[PDB]
Amino acid sequence: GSLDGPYQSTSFKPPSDYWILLNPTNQQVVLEGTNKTDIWVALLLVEPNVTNQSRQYTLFGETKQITVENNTNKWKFFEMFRSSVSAEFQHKRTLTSDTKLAGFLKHYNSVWTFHGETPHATTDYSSTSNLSEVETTIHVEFYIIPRSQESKCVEYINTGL
Numbered sequence: 001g002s003l004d005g006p007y008q009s010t011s012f013k014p015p016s017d018y019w020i021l022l023n024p025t026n027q028q029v030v031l032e033g034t035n036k037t038d039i040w041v042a043l044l045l046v047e048p049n050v051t052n053q054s055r056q057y058t059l060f061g062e063t064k065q066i067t068v069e070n071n072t073n074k075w076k077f078f079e080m081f082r083s084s085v086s087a088e089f090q091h092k093r094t095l096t097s098d099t100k101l102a103g104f105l106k107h108y109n110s111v112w113t114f115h116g117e118t119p120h121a122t123t124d125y126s127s128t129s130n131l132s133e134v135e136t137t138i139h140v141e142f143y144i145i146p147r148s149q150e151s152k153c154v155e156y157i158n159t160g161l
């Protein structure tokens, strides 16, 4: 079949009903997304077998010190989240993965991401009253997949390109 992409790293407002399939190599911050009203979401990537490692990540213009741990042989995407500009970032969800792929979707009233552990990763959401204004800074090569082909995106997440 066909897959729309790759697109190079960039900043833009993805249309609703299209998955962004993220394809990092060694980037530390993979994606930043915000509408500046009730959604701030960032995905951090941590390699296998890391214990208590203090690292630096810049999120939405704010350079942060975050200590990370990954005691598995798989990679981990950490989903960092907050609902207002002056709040602390909290670790909201995790995706444990041997494919190194993650996703981002705007649909209906929510932003969707993947969580869990491959090859059985699943989707979950954060709701918003201002979906249309969510802009994503994507730090990696990426692909676009229509929501009508979400099952293909799930396959990629779980077993790879």
Ligand SMILES: CC(=O)N[C@H]1[C@H](O[C@H]2[C@@H](O)[C@@H](CO)O[C@@H](O[C@H]3[C@H](O)[C@@H](O)[C@H](O)O[C@@H]3CO)[C@@H]2O)O[C@H](CO)[C@@H](O)[C@@H]1O[C@@H]1O[C@H](CO)[C@H](O)[C@H](O)[C@H]1O[C@@H]1O[C@@H](C)[C@@H](O)[C@@H](O)[C@@H]1O
Pocket (backbone or CB within 6 Å): 105, 107, 108, 109, 110, 112, 122, 123, 124, 125, 127, 147, 150
């Ligand atoms: C059950 C389902 O369809 N889940 C999919 C989810 O659907 C959202 C939409 O239906 C949306 C309306 O367009 O409503 C969302 O629910 C709202 C509530 O109505 C609202 O009150 C509350 O405040 O906010 C929630 C969240 O917005 C539905 O959740 O869309 C997801 C994003 O595309 C999609 O991932 C999810 O798909 C299901 O995922 C689970 C595992 O997470 C399983 O794989 C299911 O098999 C899968 O559903 C299947 O694919 C979807 C795309 C659709 O074709 C289904 O018919 C199909 O069974």
